[PDB]
């Protein structure tokens, strides 16, 4: 590695705080200037391997970092200035840690001196972020900024990845120092409880339990995402059809015929019957969140659990397994293919009478969706870019129906082409999240599946997309809706509808707002499309027209999301059956 | 007070949190529904006299309740729900908490049970915003519900107002109960050490203090806001001169010839001036924040200081005065104007020869401003703007540039007409703060002067606007870059432009966004403008076509605000000269 500074010259401690970004392999970061960053953003400027996209606002900065971090496995670094700058990452921070998502977030803070005397824009930033962080830190001297940076980037991105922030005094980003690049990270309790290499004597009974089970479930997670090669082998070593979290999606190909696809609330009726009539529940990956369980004592009733987490605190908390690994799910299986593979003959495994059960619940119960005269159906849009992107677009969504709909209708054939908030679910997500997977991933089909109140949310990052120049594609299925509220406004509260129409009811048939005329504003080609008949060719358009390019679908909107368990429910609650008509 | 219910009917947690709010009198909410708070607005559809203002993020709701708060002088309320919805209120809190601005935010949670599990859409909001809130909640039954709402309005509005956060688990919503109006309050600390009348012994010495000082100066900030008879009583019978912070803009009305204007980093020479030399300073309301004291040790040097604040904790907090009163301005306004009354021939008050000398002060170094062929100042778009309302307009602003000069250059002839983010500088306020200010002024002009780069950060809430029929008019000062950030880089880094250009580098000529095109999306009548000679018509219609409208101001980028003390300056420090021109 070359420094642009000779080892015996003092430089600005913001200076050294981007050499150690450097240092870390950092090639891009989402950094929105403010007073109390600005030698940050200038050392950023003499640095020549670094390339800032600077949002347009740091909520943005944040979901583009998240996206870029999702899609390529890399930490996602962004920048914040002190106060306000720092205040609005936080839904970004608390987004990170819930979906476990690898993350450096860097916040300028007022003068060491100035810290609580309720100085110009300065927030407790560490103390307000301390929840919602996997760790966070203060600088207190230029000295740290070596180690600090470098024990961000370790815990940010090993065992359970997740958000780190850091937070820089500005009279230590102007302190000349020479920077020591040999220090020994301070993390001695963090490092000692860290998982080791599986043990054989614990791999080899969970392939004992699976020779002994008739019928074997996948419950697949997010913590599969490194790990789809090792995972398809040990299918295609033993035959057990795989069950996917919202979270998981990809690792195991959807499009393959012993997937079950999507479990959960809005789950294929397949998977979960899958999971309530299993006898042995594989969950790689998992963390049992109520969504996909809903009432524990009845989730996988009739199963031995078999779970396997790197993070010692998910086994056990919501359902007790019977075996446990605690360890990366990666060596895990690594491990188990190999026993599987000696031992093939002597196991002959053969799931073929339980994964044709599951074949003619696939028929009975398979997804599905009504097409009312030319109107077009968001499920068969989805479904539209899939063949037309042959499925290896990078797809990020918003949240709620649309989302469902993506998760549901796109066939993803590698993990991180499914960029989703998950566990907090935060609406405005999709579009700088589409932005951060462009630059991590500049050859790939972007493509951001939108809602039209998550969309607008950070609407302004349009503009960055247009001085960027990323081909980001943005399909919105637009219902004129907050159309997950709506549905449960449906089904629990006989249709009253609470604050969820986003149109002008003064105008209540014209399309409000005007998207094509965001799209216009930031010099982005746009179009609208109507009729279902149309449709192949609008996408075609979107995907063909080099650069960003704006599609609003328009959809009608009392279509539900199907199927549905009700919060705290069992298998039998399920609704598989209505929407909003008359 | 009627209710909607039997006095022995129970119903909903939800309902009664309604009720709660029409007992307390309010007549406005900004809310955003999700999962975790249906239930509040299904409960707020059943009630006739709270309306809802559904924004387009929650951070325009919180900056919408702030401006509704700053510009009315009633509490803010804004209603989230839990997770990404809680979050997204984080700016609008630490802003009211630095800003002192009365608001009671209320979140949706996830059932009671489900706390600390890491839940679907789970933050532990509480934990959050213990930092930057004056008190919060977790209502933990249904019971507390009618005590916990009478008490976060009671403690956002007395004393030192504030944000007050209030999170309401969903199973408590779904409660059916029966409250009771009649609970006391459990403040025994708060309610004890709230400060009394004003002791009559203080109020004389400061009198005798007068009257033995030949170089007074009034020293007026935000605390002042309600006390604006009070306080022009006493310098129509004291004649002392007045300067103003950012935020006690209009406390004495800037067009008063006894007025020194805005004093601080920003404020006039001879604001500053006047405290340099003074031999009194009468701190009313104010905070000695850095902004306006640079150098602790050499502000005010040579002056016996008044203190008069409602907060103890901020009486000799960064400079110790030699006199303080701990209470309400207004009432010590009132006790000294009738002591003035009384001795004003015994007293024989004349401070002709020092405000005399502070008027060759402001002869020599009035604000001042190049006008360069036909290109816009912003500076003379804000006094046409003054002129053409005849001063009577509620003014929101952005954060930068244009914010001083639109405390520069409007004549505030009331305390709330002037909404703008002081202590914490938060972007993106000015948009939905007039939207507040409208719905709280239905009669009123209202303006939000605002800058390119804040604008955009909450551009959403043109929709808002629109559905809403509100009139708010968007004077937007555009000059394509961070223009203080901009600034800086001038004066304290050699021009060197990091990220703070926001047009397109592509075509660098272009007008980027094309703002005209926003309001176009939400059908709101635009004009963009660049000859001065056009400015004056542009503002007429603008404030002549009924409704909304943008108009864009194009201004040259290279102005800089003057005049300017350096951070941690002194007044020898200020520079009176120059831009980032050639
Ligand atoms: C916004 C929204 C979300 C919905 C939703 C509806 C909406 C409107 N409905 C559904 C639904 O119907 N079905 C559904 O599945 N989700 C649904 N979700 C998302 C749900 O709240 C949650 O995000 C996921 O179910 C959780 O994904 P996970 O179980 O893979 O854990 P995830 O959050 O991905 O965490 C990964 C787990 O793996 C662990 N881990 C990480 N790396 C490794 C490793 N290398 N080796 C071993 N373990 C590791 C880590 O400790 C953690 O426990
Ligand atoms: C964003 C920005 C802001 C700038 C700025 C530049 C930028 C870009 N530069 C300047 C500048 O040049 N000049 C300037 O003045 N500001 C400037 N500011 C704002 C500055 O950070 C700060 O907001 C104000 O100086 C503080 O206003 P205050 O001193 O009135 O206290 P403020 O924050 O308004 O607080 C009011 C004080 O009065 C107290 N109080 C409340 N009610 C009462 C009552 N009824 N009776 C007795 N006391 C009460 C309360 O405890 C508090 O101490
Ligand atoms: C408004 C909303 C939803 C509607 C999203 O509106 P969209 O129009 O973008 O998407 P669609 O459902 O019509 O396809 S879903 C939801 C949940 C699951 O809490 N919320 C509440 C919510 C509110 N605010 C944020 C930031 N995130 C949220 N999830
Ligand atoms: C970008 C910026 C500023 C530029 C504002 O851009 P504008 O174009 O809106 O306003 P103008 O200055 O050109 O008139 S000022 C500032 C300060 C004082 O911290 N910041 C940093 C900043 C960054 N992000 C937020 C939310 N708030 C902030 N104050
Ligand atoms: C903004 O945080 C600060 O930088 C700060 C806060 C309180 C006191 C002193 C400072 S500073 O002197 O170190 N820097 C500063 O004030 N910067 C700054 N201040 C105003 C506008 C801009 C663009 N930058
Ligand atoms: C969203 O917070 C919750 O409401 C929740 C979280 C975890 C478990 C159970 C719940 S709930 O059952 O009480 N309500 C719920 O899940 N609501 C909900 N869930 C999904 C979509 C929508 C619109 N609403
Ligand atoms: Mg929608
Ligand atoms: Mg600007």
């Given at each position: 590695?070359?420094?642009?500074?000779?080892?015996?010259?003092?430089?600005?401690?913001?200076?050294?705080?981007?050499?150690?970004?450097?240092?870390?392999?950092?090639?891009?970061?989402?950094?929105?200037?403010?007073?109390?960053?600005?030698?940050?953003?200038?050392?950023?400027?003499?640095?020549?391997?670094?390339?800032?996209?600077?949002?347009?606002?740091?909520?943005?900065?944040?979901?583009?970092?998240?996206?870029?971090?999702?899609?390529?496995?890399?930490?996602?670094?962004?920048?914040?200035?002190?106060?306000?700058?720092?205040?609005?990452?936080?839904?970004?921070?608390?987004?990170?840690?819930?979906?476990?998502?690898?993350?450096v977030?860097?916040?300028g803070?007022?003068?060491?001196?100035?810290?609580?005397?309720?100085?110009?824009?300065?927030?407790?930033?560490?103390?307000?972020?301390?929840?919602?962080t996997?760790?966070?830190?203060?600088?207190?001297?230029?000295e740290?900024?070596?180690?600090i940076?470098?024990?961000?980037?370790?815990?940010?991105?090993?065992?359970?990845?997740?958000?780190?922030?850091?937070?820089?005094?500005?009279?230590?980003?102007?302190?000349?120092?020479?920077?020591?690049?040999?220090?020994?990270?301070?993390?001695?309790?963090?490092?000692?409880?860290?998982?080791?290499?599986?043990?054989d004597?614990?791999?080899?009974?969970?392939?004992?339990?699976?020779?002994?089970?008739?019928?074997?479930?996948?419950?697949?997670?997010?913590?599969?995402?490194?790990?789809?090669?090792?995972?398809?082998?040990?299918?295609?070593?033993?035959?057990?059809?795989?069950?996917?979290?919202?979270?998981?999606?990809?690792?195991?190909?959807?499009?393959?015929?012993?997937?079950?696809?999507?479990?959960?609330?809005?789950?294929?009726?397949?998977?979960?019957?899958?999971?309530?009539?299993?006898?042995?529940?594989?969950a790689?990956?998992?963390?049992?969140?109520?969504?996909?369980?809903?009432?524990?004592?009845?989730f996988?009733?009739?199963?031995?659990?078999?779970?396997?987490?790197?993070?010692?605190?998910?086994?056990?908390?919501?359902?007790?397994?019977?075996?446990?690994?605690?360890?990366?799910?990666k060596?895990?299986?690594?491990?188990?293919?190999?026993?599987?593979?000696?031992?093939?003959?002597?196991?002959?495994?053969?799931?073929?009478?339980?994964?044709?059960?599951?074949?003619?619940?696939?028929?009975?119960?398979?997804?599905?969706?009504?097409?009312?005269?030319?109107?077009?159906?968001?499920?068969?849009?989805?479904?539209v870019?899939?063949?037309?992107?042959?499925?290896?677009?990078?797809?990020?969504?918003?949240?709620?129906?649309?989302?469902?709909?993506?998760?549901?209708?796109?066939?993803?054939?590698?993990?991180?082409?499914?960029?989703?908030?998950?566990?907090?679910?935060?609406?405005?997500?999709?579009?700088?999240?589409?932005?951060?997977?462009?630059?991590?991933?500049?050859?790939?089909?972007?493509?951001?599946?939108?809602?039209?109140?998550?969309?607008?949310?950070?609407?302004?990052?349009?503009?960055?997309?247009?001085?960027?120049?990323?081909?980001?594609?943005?399909?919105?299925l637009?219902?004129?809706?907050?159309?997950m509220?709506?549905?449960?406004?449906?089904?629990?509260?006989?249709?009253?509808?609470?604050?969820?129409?986003?149109?002008?009811?003064?105008?209540?048939?014209?399309?409000?707002?005007?998207?094509?005329?965001?799209?216009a504003?930031?010099?982005?080609?746009?179009?609208?499309v109507?009729?279902?008949a149309?449709?192949?060719?609008?996408?075609?358009?979107?995907?063909?027209?080099?650069?960003?390019?704006?599609?609003?679908?328009?959809?009608?909107?009392?279509?539900?999301?199907?199927?549905?368990?009700?919060?705290?429910?069992?298998?039998?609650?399920?609704?598989?059956?209505?929407?909003?008509?008359?």
């Open positions: 590695f070359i420094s642009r500074f000779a080892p015996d010259q003092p430089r600005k401690g913001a200076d050294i705080l981007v050499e150690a970004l450097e240092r870390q392999g950092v090639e891009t970061v989402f950094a929105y200037p403010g007073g109390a960053s600005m030698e940050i953003h200038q050392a950023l400027t003499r640095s020549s391997s670094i390339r800032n996209v600077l949002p347009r606002h740091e909520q943005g900065g944040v979901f583009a970092a998240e996206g870029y971090a999702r899609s390529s496995g890399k930490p996602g670094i962004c920048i914040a200035t002190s106060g306000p700058g720092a205040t609005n990452l936080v839904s970004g921070l608390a987004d990170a840690l819930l979906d476990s998502v690898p993350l977030a860097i916040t803070q007022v003068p060491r001196r100035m810290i609580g005397t309720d100085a110009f824009q300065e927030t407790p930033i560490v103390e307000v972020t301390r929840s919602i996997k760790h966070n830190y203060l600088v207190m001297d230029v740290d900024i070596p180690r940076i470098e024990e961000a980037f370790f815990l940010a991105t090993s065992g359970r990845p997740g958000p780190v922030l850091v937070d820089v005094p500005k009279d230590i980003q102007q302190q000349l120092a020479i920077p020591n690049w040999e220090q020994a990270m301070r993390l001695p309790g963090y490092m000692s409880r860290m998982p080791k290499p599986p043990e004597s614990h791999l080899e009974q969970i392939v004992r339990l699976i020779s002994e089970s008739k019928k074997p479930v996948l419950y697949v997670g997010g913590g599969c995402l490194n790990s789809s090669d090792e995972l398809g082998r040990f299918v295609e070593l033993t035959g057990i059809p795989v069950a996917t979290t919202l979270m998981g999606l990809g690792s195991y190909p959807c499009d393959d015929e012993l997937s079950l696809h999507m479990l959960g609330m809005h789950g294929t009726v397949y998977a979960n019957y899958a999971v309530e009539h299993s006898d042995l529940l594989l790689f990956g998992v963390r049992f969140d109520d969504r996909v369980t809903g009432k524990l004592e009845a996988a009733s009739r199963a031995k659990i078999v779970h396997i987490d790197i993070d010692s605190a998910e086994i056990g908390k919501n359902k007790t397994p019977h075996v446990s690994v605690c360890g990366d799910v060596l895990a299986l690594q491990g188990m293919n190999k026993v599987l593979e000696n031992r093939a003959e002597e196991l002959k495994l053969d799931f073929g009478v339980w994964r044709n059960e599951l074949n003619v619940q696939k028929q009975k119960f398979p997804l599905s969706f009504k097409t009312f005269g030319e109107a077009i159906p968001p499920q068969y849009a989805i479904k870019l899939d063949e037309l992107t042959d499925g290896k677009a990078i797809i990020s969504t918003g949240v709620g129906q649309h989302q469902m709909w993506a998760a549901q209708f796109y066939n993803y054939k590698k993990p991180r082409q499914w960029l989703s908030s998950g566990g907090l679910g935060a609406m405005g997500f999709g579009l700088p999240a589409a932005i951060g997977a462009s630059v991590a991933n500049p050859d790939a089909i972007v493509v951001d599946i939108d809602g039209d109140g998550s969309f607008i949310m950070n609407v302004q990052e349009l503009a960055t997309i247009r001085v960027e120049n990323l081909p980001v594609k943005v399909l919105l637009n219902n004129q809706h907050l159309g509220v709506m549905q449960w406004e449906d089904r629990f509260y006989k249709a009253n509808r609470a604050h969820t129409f986003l149109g002008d009811p003064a105008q209540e048939d014209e399309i409000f707002p005007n998207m094509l005329l965001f799209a504003a930031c010099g982005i080609p746009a179009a609208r109507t009729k279902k149309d449709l192949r060719e609008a996408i075609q358009t979107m995907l063909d027209t080099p650069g960003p390019y704006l599609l609003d679908v328009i959809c009608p909107h009392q279509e539900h999301v199907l199927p549905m368990i009700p919060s705290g429910g069992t298998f039998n609650d399920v609704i598989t059956e209505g929407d909003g008509r008359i």
